[PDB]
Amino acid sequence: YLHWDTDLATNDEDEAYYKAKLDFAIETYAKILFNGEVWQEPLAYVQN
Amino acid sequence: LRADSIAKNLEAQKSDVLVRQLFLERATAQRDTLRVVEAIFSTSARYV
Amino acid sequence: INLLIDAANAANRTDRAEIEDYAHLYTQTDIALETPQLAYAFQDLKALQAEVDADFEWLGEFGIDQEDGNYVQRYHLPAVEALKAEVDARVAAIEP
Amino acid sequence: INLLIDAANAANRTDRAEIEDYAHLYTQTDIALETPQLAYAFQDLKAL
């Protein structure tokens, strides 16, 4: 919440933000497939 | 130029973007866990 | 004043080089005494106001955040700002 | 600035007592660097 590794050297600190945004997007796209395959569609079939 | 630089560089120290990214990621995890739990409850209710 | 001073003093992470610890009010005289030298006290108060306004611009630098132990946290600036506004109002009151 | 400074420095004949040689700009910091301490530079300019 309040650490050095969060407010870095330059005021810009844009490269770290973009790297984190990339990692977050990768995780979100993987999670879409994971959740769709594990529980969403087995439930959707019964509801249909 | 110096006046504007001071004014904007001071304001760019109030906020820390990496904390806000961390909170966004936590909110996403909360959302998907929430829909998993809601599916559990709806499934149990229909089963009963 | 003194509580805000200590709040701002504890809310900084720099290595004392350019933003320094603010000394407590009235180092020259003891204002608890019945008859103190009040000119010294007003001098110290004006010195504090000037020092705060001077460190303001070093708060607005790009490269202040350098290293573990030399950097500026996001809560330092509101503490300094509250201290500055309070000193400004206090001086405006003490003038007449 | 620096060329005019050296022009004025070479155009005096006094013995340095009251009109002195002007030092070259930004003795405190190296402004060639990517991130210099610009407050020091502005201080030096105002001093000049």
DSSP C28: S
Count other C-beta atoms under 10 Å from residue C48's C-beta: 21
Please, which residues have CB within 8 angstroms of residue B36's CB and are 6 or more apart in sequence? A35, A39
Please, which residues have CB within 8 angstroms of residue A40's CB and are 6 or more apart in sequence? none
> CB of C31 within 8 A of CB of C41?
yes
Q: What angle do CA C11, C13, C19 make, to 5 degrees?
A: 90
Task: For residues D12 and B10, give the distance between their C-alpha atoms in angstroms, rounded to a whole number.
Answer: 44
Task: For residues A29 and A23, give the distance between their C-alpha atoms in angstroms, rounded to a whole number.
Answer: 10
> CB of C22 within 8 A of CB of C1?
no
**Which member of A7, A9, A10 has the closest CB to residue C73?**
A7
Task: For residues B9 and C18, give the distance between their C-alpha atoms in angstroms, rounded to a whole number.
Answer: 17
- CA neighbor of C27 nearest in space, from C7, C11, C51, C53: C51
**Which member of C65, C68, C75 has the closest CB to residue A11?**
C65
Q: How far is CA D38 from CA C16, C60, D27, D35, in A?
A: 18, 11, 12, 8
> CB of C1 within 8 A of CB of C25?
yes
Q: Is residue C80 packed enough to be buried (19+ CB in 10 Å), middle (13-18) or exposed (0-12)?
A: buried
Provide DSSP, B4-37. HHHHHHHHHHH--HHHHHHHHHHHHHHHHHHHHH
Q: At what angle do helices C38-59 and B2-14 cross, to 10 degrees?
A: 90
CB pairs under 8 A between C and D: 10
Task: For residues D21 and D36, give the distance between their C-alpha atoms in angstroms, rounded to a whole number.
Answer: 25
Tokens of C69: 């132990």
- CA neighbor of B36 nearest in space, from A21, A31, A29: A31
Q: What count of Cα atoms within 13 Å lies in the side-chain half-sphere of residue C9?
A: 11
Partners of B24 on chain A (C-beta within 8 Å) are 24
> CB of C22 within 8 A of CB of C6?
no
Task: Give which of A3, A4, A6, A10 to mutate to test B binding, by max B Cβ within 10 Å.
Answer: A6
To one decimal, the resolution in angstroms is 2.5
Task: For residues D26 and A36, give the distance between their C-alpha atoms in angstroms, rounded to a whole number.
Answer: 62
Please name the amino acid found at residue C43. Q
A29 touches chain B (CB under 8 A): no
Phi/psi for C67 (5° steps) reads -155, 165
Please, which residues have CB within 8 angstroms of residue B9's CB and are 6 or more apart in sequence? A11, C60, C61, C62
CB distance D39–C62 less than 8 Å? no
Task: For residues D1 and D20, give the distance between their C-alpha atoms in angstroms, rounded to a whole number.
Answer: 17
Partners of A2 on chain C (C-beta within 8 Å) are 73-75
With a CB-CB cutoff of 8 Å, which residues 3-42 of chain B face chain A? 9, 12-13, 16-19, 21-22, 24-25, 28, 32, 36, 39
Q: Provide the shortest C-alpha distance from residue C1 to chain A (in Å).
A: 26
C66 touches chain D (CB under 8 A): no
DSSP C65: -
The dihedral through the CA atoms of D10, D12, D14, D16 has a sign that is negative
Tokens of C15: 């290595």
Looking up tokens 């945004």, which residue turns up? A21
Q: Provide the shortest C-alpha distance from residue D12 to chain B (in Å).
A: 33
Q: What spatial distance separates the first Cα and last Cα of chain A, rounded to whole Å? A: 45
Please name the amino acid found at residue D12. N
Task: For residues A24 and A16, give the distance between their C-alpha atoms in angstroms, rounded to a whole number.
Answer: 12
Count other C-beta atoms under 10 Å from residue C86's C-beta: 14
Task: For residues C80 and C62, give the distance between their C-alpha atoms in angstroms, rounded to a whole number.
Answer: 18
Task: Give C70's strand partners.
Answer: C67
Containing H/E element for D43? helix D38-47
> CB of D19 within 8 A of CB of D30?
no
